[PDB]
RNA sequence: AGGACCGAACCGACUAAUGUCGAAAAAUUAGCGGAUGACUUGUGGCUGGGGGUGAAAGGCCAAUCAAACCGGGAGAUAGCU
RNA sequence: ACACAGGUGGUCAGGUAGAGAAUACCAAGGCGCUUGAGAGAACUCGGGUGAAGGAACUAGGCAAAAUGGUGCCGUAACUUC
RNA sequence: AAUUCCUUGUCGGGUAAGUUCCGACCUGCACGAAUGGCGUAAUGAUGGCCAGGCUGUCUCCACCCGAGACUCAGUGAAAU
RNA sequence: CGAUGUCGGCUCAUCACAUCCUGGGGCUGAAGUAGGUCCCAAGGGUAUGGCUGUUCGCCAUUUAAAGUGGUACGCGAGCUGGGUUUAGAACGUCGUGAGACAGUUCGGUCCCUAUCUGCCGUGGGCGCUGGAGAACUGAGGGGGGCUGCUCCUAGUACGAGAGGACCGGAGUGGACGCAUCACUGGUGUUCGGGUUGUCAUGCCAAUGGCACUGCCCGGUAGCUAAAUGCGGAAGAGAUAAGUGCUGAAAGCAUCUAAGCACGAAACUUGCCCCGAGAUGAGUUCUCCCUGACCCUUUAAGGGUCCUGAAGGAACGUUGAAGACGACGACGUUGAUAGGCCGGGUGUGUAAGCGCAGCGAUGCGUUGAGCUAACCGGUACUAAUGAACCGUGAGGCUUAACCU
């Protein structure tokens, strides 16, 4: 089915009576309000656009404000989109709560991983460090060779070099839903999800069974 | 100039 | 380490196509003294947002 | 990679930074307004405003803390004698930064930092 | 975290005193041996009339590590040294008849029941 | 976070007694040999305490049959059934890691009797 | 007492790193050797080019050494480029 | 060749600790080394710390780590004693 | 063997595993007696090998402190 | 030959397939297990040590396996320098000798600030035909794809016994990857404490500087691995080798000629990420601007005045964003940062005072004091009115509909 848009509310653990400790990420999933329903006749595919949270009526622009007023919902902190799965139908202005996940066992969570900035090859690609001693000249964390010789005469595309690490769209799949608490608007999922505290997460039912 | 340094020895292609 | 051919005036100017300075888009007029100044900077006489703050 | 970290290094080591901010705190308490660089002023807020918060309560242990942190008895007296009573009702924010152009010799962003009572 | 060249104390009375891990068994490129793990050892130090000889190559099961085991609740059990029980090289079947120092529940399996029974603790 | 504090309060146990590093403490924890649920005692000196609300832990250092053992217990973990202070110690450090390189007579803490 | 020992100055230069369009045409930093002697150092002097001097490496003889440098024979000669 | 991390003989040489002209902190005295201001990526340099392991590194324990003082006890083979 | 080609000779020791090392053998390609032979205490910034300790040398890197690198202002090269 | 750096190692690879493992199959002198041989198959994977400068090889112990080759037997403007290749020295040997040795032995400077191509990242410009804010589609591209063991089936099939399955399930690992910091830890020169030497604050007391953070002991946040969650798939399509069904040519036979099936980690998908400069520049939603004159070759023309929207940019406070740009959040109608308040955390019973003691010191006040980056609040300070850019209804042709 479709997913929800939550916010990463940090991590903690659930102690169970049988003794186990479960590391859970806490995702506050407020009501996702449908701002637009896309269909084959007009858009060519079936999806719902949702919003969540709240913005200020000075940071919401006139185009955004009109797009929200057409739906009848109040402005949220952005818009997301979920493809419909042939069996569900949503109306503009409908609220979807975390109760959508009441029966879900595993979810995929998509976040924007924490940004590491410009990373070297050791950190970014698990490149092996060269010698610390034994004669090494200024070449301890340097990448080593990047190509062969005259015969290729070039570096191949997709060479693992240094560059921007993190700050990108990551999906962690098949995380156990530990708890769905509808009154608190909370989803407790086992393990870590991408991103920092307070970042948007997209939680949808697991695509691999 | 007046002083030209000796060039560095080549790689010993021997 | 070093070039095999000298670059051209064309390549030189194309590289310098990003070296152009940006002028300050606008200057601020002081509430009280009416002097020009940078946003969020005191004026040359020591006013900021209409009040004498330095008296230099 | 600097996530959630505070404190400007200011291209100094820790001992030099500590001594420089001790001196600058003394100078700001003495003159009630000083012209420095903008990053130095922003970093000096976190040095001088705790000193005034300390000086709000006048005990011997507080005098000795202020001395351990400023190393100037004239400064420790101006705090606890003038600035503490002056800012007794301020809930923080005893300093004000005013950006003032750029330095001639190196084009450094300049800022005045003053105490918000200096209206005389 | 036992790897090759790690020296372990001997937790049984098979005669060995210090052994060296020469191979972490099970899996290519496998790096470490935790508690319930079988390693290949050589005997670096033994007692004169023991059941094993110095320089013997055989197997051993780790029973205590300084690194320790973590429990499902997050708890940790660490020890002040790495110890192992020597096993016959073909069938594991501990060589000694006594076992010194405590062990952990991680050793409660079908093949180390002898060890879990002979141990003086846990 | 208020949300996480609310989720952790509802799990924190209230029976947790007061103890300090240096105190000799018996921790009774739950052991499972399959069907039966037994209670096992671990008595030793508290060498470290980590106060983090629900994530609080404490390291107890025992000297078992020969080998010395340390056990980091999670305080609010349901496997820890009970914590009792058998003896109060009079150290003046928060962490007693120097007790690791001490044995016998050099490893004994004077009693607090405060 | 000692071409004794440990160790500063001092005299060296074993290792490593840096530097290698250097701070430096030989260094710096950390260690290292000798450190009352066949020691080290100042000032002055003497030995000179097939000559000197050399606890000897063809080492050194003014950042030049299997024959210094300067000037001359000299526009040597160059079946080579 | 430089306002150059080099070289350059002699004399004077205080305090506390110290065996000391070592070393640390100071005195007298003299300086902050003639680009600064920010930021706080990779990587390089110079350092600090490090779970478990402990030479598995490597040509080689290179480098690093380690040892380190005084007094007393005690000290093997071998020896030219 | 600073000498031995075959050759990593053989046997012994040391290692789980030793082309190195140490001991011995002698089949010395091609030792040998002042161009000295053999030994040798002490000595050596000497060559080789082993052990204890010690460790970021390594498994396998992590973090931190500074100087650069990066941005701004000023000055302003070089090989090619 | 007016120089194309030469072994091995390291680092990083990349391709082939003559395939080492895993996958599929035929034959077997294939009972099972386990093999042999051949065919298909390159998706992924494909040891650590001792010796030696080694490539190689020997050995030890693993592994599902420890593939074979190409790539200047890849890779020194990436590293090393043990070997080979200078100058010293010695041995054996050769030579009268100087010297020589695919003989050995000890020692012996490894430069380059990247212009271009390439590659990894990240921006600016313009375009995309009125402008703008969003959300998408998805051409196309990349990533990923490994595998052990145990148990059930079942001690069943098979087998005289020994031994011992296929097929199909379940669990738990190794290596690899992604994320994260709840836990366990590392770090934590920005927190607290102990302590040595010395100097200073007049002195005592208390503090501060310096001594590598002087040396240490702990330790917040952040970052992080050794910590912890997750992943490789299932499925689908089309196939390889192979196996067929029906079936003539060729009355039979025949997998093939017509036709119809099955068939593998290979291929296309499915999973994840990028992605409309996809100039073939796409779609959807929303928002904004509907004022006049002059001139000329009355041109998709130029000029003047008035008008400046949506939005943006700039500036400021900044960020779990970041080299810089960029990106995100705020700018008084405000929690953006600092301060402050409360808490937490860490350290660990401050100072002063009093008491005991000859004193060092202990005790009480007191789990005190202090406490970074944390949490929750709070306009005290700083985020200024403005100004700036961006316009004024958007070409032609044709077609389809209301006039
Ligand atoms: Mg970041
Ligand atoms: Mg170098
Ligand atoms: Mg280096
Ligand atoms: Mg430029
Ligand atoms: Mg911050
Ligand atoms: Mg200091
Ligand atoms: Mg309590
Ligand atoms: Mg002497
Ligand atoms: Mg000297
Ligand atoms: Mg000399
Ligand atoms: Mg040397
Ligand atoms: Mg000597
Ligand atoms: Mg000496
Ligand atoms: Mg003289
Ligand atoms: Mg010679
Ligand atoms: Mg000379
Ligand atoms: Mg001549
Ligand atoms: Mg001449
Ligand atoms: Mg002539
Ligand atoms: Mg001529
Ligand atoms: Mg100068
Ligand atoms: Mg000078
Ligand atoms: Mg002295
Ligand atoms: Mg001195
Ligand atoms: Mg740095
Ligand atoms: Mg260190
Ligand atoms: Mg370590
Ligand atoms: Mg520690
Ligand atoms: Mg350790
Ligand atoms: Mg050890
Ligand atoms: Mg080795
Ligand atoms: Mg190796
Ligand atoms: Mg090496
Ligand atoms: Mg060394
Ligand atoms: Mg050292
Ligand atoms: Mg010979
Ligand atoms: Mg021999
Ligand atoms: Mg001879
Ligand atoms: Mg003779
Ligand atoms: Mg000598
Ligand atoms: Mg060895
Ligand atoms: Mg630069
Ligand atoms: Mg500049
Ligand atoms: Mg040539
Ligand atoms: Mg040429
Ligand atoms: Mg093939
Ligand atoms: Mg393949
Ligand atoms: Mg392919
Ligand atoms: Mg595939
Ligand atoms: Mg070797
Ligand atoms: Mg061989
Ligand atoms: Mg070549
Ligand atoms: Mg090659
Ligand atoms: Mg190259
Ligand atoms: Mg090479
Ligand atoms: Mg190089
Ligand atoms: Mg060499
Ligand atoms: Mg020679
Ligand atoms: Mg694909
Ligand atoms: Mg691919
Ligand atoms: Mg945390
Ligand atoms: Mg810690
Ligand atoms: Mg620390
Ligand atoms: Mg931490
Ligand atoms: Mg004084
Ligand atoms: Mg005092
Ligand atoms: Mg001083
Ligand atoms: Mg000093
Ligand atoms: Mg499939
Ligand atoms: Mg604030
Ligand atoms: Mg007290
Ligand atoms: Mg007190
Ligand atoms: Mg006191
Ligand atoms: Mg406290
Ligand atoms: Mg507080
Ligand atoms: Mg106000």
From Swiss-Prot, chain A:
Post-translational modification (record): Methylated by PrmB.
One example of a Gene Ontology biological process annotation: ribosomal large subunit assembly
Pfam families referenced in this protein's UniProt entry, alphabetically: Ribosomal_L3
Name of this protein: Large ribosomal subunit protein uL3
Modified residues (N6-succinyllysine): 38
Modification N5-methylglutamine, positions: 150
UniProt KW Metal-binding keyword: no
InterPro entries: Ribosomal_uL3, Ribosomal_uL3_bac/org-type, Ribosomal_uL3_CS, Transl_B-barrel_sf
Function: One of two assembly initiator proteins, it binds directly near the 3'-end of the 23S rRNA, where it nucleates assembly of the 50S subunit.
Organism in which the protein naturally occurs: Escherichia coli (strain K12)
UniProtKB/Swiss-Prot annotation, chain C:
GO MF terms, alphabetically ordered: structural constituent of ribosome
Residue ranges, annotated region (Disordered): 1-37
GO BP annotations listed: cytoplasmic translation; response to radiation; response to reactive oxygen species; ribosomal large subunit assembly
Record's keyword annotation contains Membrane: no
UniProt superkingdom: Bacteria
InterPro entries, per the entry: Ribosomal_bL32, Ribosomal_bL32_bact, Ribosomal_zn-bd
Disulphide linkage map: none
GO cellular component: cytoplasm; cytosol; cytosolic large ribosomal subunit
Keyword annotations of the record: Ribonucleoprotein, Ribosomal protein
Family: Belongs to the bacterial ribosomal protein bL32 family.
Complex formation: Part of the 50S ribosomal subunit. Contacts L17.
Matching HAMAP family: Ribosomal_bL32
Protein name: Large ribosomal subunit protein bL32
Gene label: rpmF
UniProtKB/Swiss-Prot annotation, chain D:
Gene Ontology CC annotation, any one: cytosol
Biological processes, Gene Ontology terms: cytoplasmic translation; ribosomal large subunit assembly
Keyword RNA-binding: no
Keywords: Ribonucleoprotein, Ribosomal protein
GO function term, MF aspect, one: structural constituent of ribosome
Family assignment from sequence similarity: Belongs to the bacterial ribosomal protein bL17 family.
Purpose: Requires L15 for assembly into the 50S subunit.
Xref: NCBIfam families: L17
UniProt subunit comment: Part of the 50S ribosomal subunit. Contacts protein L32.
Annotated protein name in UniProt: Large ribosomal subunit protein bL17
Originating organism: Escherichia coli (strain K12)
From Swiss-Prot, chain F:
Transmembrane segments: none
Induction trigger: Part of the rpsP-rimM-trmD-rplS operon.
A cellular component annotation (GO) from this entry: cytosolic large ribosomal subunit
Quaternary structure and partners: Part of the 50S ribosomal subunit. Contacts L14. Forms two bridges to the 30S subunit in the 70S ribosome, contacting the 16S rRNA. In pre-50S ribosomal subunits interacts with RsfS, which may inhibit association with the 30S subunit.
Record InterPro entries: Ribosomal_bL19, Ribosomal_bL19_CS, Ribosomal_bL19_sf, Translation_prot_SH3-like_sf
Gene behind this protein: rplS
Protein name in the entry: Large ribosomal subunit protein bL19
A GO biological process held by the record: cytoplasmic translation
SUPFAM superfamilies with a match to the protein in the record: Translation proteins SH3-like domain (SSF50104)
Keywords carried by this UniProt record: Ribonucleoprotein, Ribosomal protein, RNA-binding, rRNA-binding
Stated role: This protein is located at the 30S-50S ribosomal subunit interface and may play a role in the structure and function of the aminoacyl-tRNA binding site.
Matches recorded under PROSITE patterns: RIBOSOMAL_L19 (PS01015)
Family the entry assigns: Belongs to the bacterial ribosomal protein bL19 family.
Organism of derivation: Escherichia coli (strain K12)
């Amino acid at each position: 089915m479709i997913g929800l848009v939550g916010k990463k509310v940090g991590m903690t653990r659930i102690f169970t009576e049988d003794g186990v400790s479960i590391p859970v990420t806490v995702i506050e999933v407020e009501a996702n309000r449908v701002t637009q329903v896309k269909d084959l006749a007009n858009d060519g595919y079936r999806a719902i656009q949702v919003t969540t949270g709240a913005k200020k009526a000075n940071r919401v622009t006139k185009p955004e404000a009109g797009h929200f007023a057409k739906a009848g919902v109040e402005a949220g902190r952005g818009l997301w989109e979920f493809r419909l799965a042939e069996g569900e139908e949503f109306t503009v202005g409908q609220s979807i709560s975390v109760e959508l996940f009441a029966d879900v066992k595993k979810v995929d969570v998509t976040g924007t991983s924490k940004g590491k900035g410009f990373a070297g090859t050791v950190k970014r690609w698990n490149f092996r460090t060269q010698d610390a001693t034994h004669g090494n000249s200024l070449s301890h964390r340097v990448p080593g060779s990047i190509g062969q010789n005259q015969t290729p005469g070039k570096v191949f595309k997709g060479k693992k070099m240094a560059g921007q690490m993190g700050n990108e769209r990551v999906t962690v799949q098949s995380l156990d839903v530990v708890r769905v608490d509808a009154e608190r608007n909370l989803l407790l999922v086992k393990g870590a999800v991408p991103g920092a505290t307070g970042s948007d997460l997209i939680v949808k039912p697991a695509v691999k069974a | 100039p007046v002083y030209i340094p000796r060039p560095r020895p080549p790689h010993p292609r021997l | 380490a070093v070039q095999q051919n000298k670059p051209t005036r064309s390549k030189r100017g194309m590289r310098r196509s990003h070296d152009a300075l940006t002028a300050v888009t606008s200057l601020s007029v002081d509430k009280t003294s009416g002097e020009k100044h940078l946003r969020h900077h005191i004026t040359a006489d020591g006013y900021y947002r209409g009040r004498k703050v330095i008296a230099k | 990679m600097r996530h959630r970290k505070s404190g400007r290094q200011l291209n100094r080591n820790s001992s030099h930074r500590q001594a420089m901010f001790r001196n600058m705190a003394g100078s700001l308490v003495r003159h009630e307004i000083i012209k420095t660089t903008l990053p130095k002023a922003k970093e000096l807020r976190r040095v001088v405003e705790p000193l005034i918060t300390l000086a709000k309560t006048d005990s011997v242990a507080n005098r000795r803390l202020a001395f351990a942190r400023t190393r100037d008895n004239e400064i420790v007296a101006k705090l606890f004698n003038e600035l503490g009573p002056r800012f007794a009702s301020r809930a923080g924010g005893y300093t004000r930064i005013l950006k003032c152009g750029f330095r001639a010799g190196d084009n450094a962003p300049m800022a005045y930092i003053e105490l918000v009572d200096r209206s005389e | 975290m036992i790897q090759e060249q790690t020296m372990l104390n001997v937790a049984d009375n098979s005669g060995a005193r210090r052994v060296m891990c020469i191979k972490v068994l099970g899996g290519s490129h496998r790096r470490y041996a935790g508690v319930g793990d079988i390693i290949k050892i050589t005997i670096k130090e033994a007692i004169p009339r023991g059941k094993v000889k110095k320089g013997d190559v055989l197997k051993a099961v780790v029973v205590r590590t300084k690194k320790g085991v973590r429990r499902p609740d997050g708890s940790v059990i660490r020890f002040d040294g790495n110890a192992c029980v020597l096993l016959n090289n073909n069938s594991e079947q501990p060589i000694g008849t006594r076992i010194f120092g405590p062990v952990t529940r991680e050793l409660r399996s079908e093949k180390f029941m002898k060890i879990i029974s002979l141990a003086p603790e846990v | 976070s208020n949300i996480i504090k609310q989720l952790e309060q509802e799990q924190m146990k209230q029976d947790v007694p007061s103890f300090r590093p240096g105190d000799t403490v018996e921790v009774k924890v739950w052991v499972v040999e399959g069907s039966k649920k037994r209670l096992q005692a671990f008595e030793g000196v508290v060498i470290a305490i980590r106060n983090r609300g629900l994530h609080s832990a404490f390291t107890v250092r025992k000297i078992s049959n020969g080998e010395g053992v340390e056990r980091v217990f999670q305080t609010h973990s349901p496997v820890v059934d009970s914590i009792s202070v058998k003896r109060r110690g009079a150290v003046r450090k928060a962490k007693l890691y120097y007790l690791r390189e001490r044995t016998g007579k050099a490893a004994r803490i004077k009693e607090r009797l405060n």
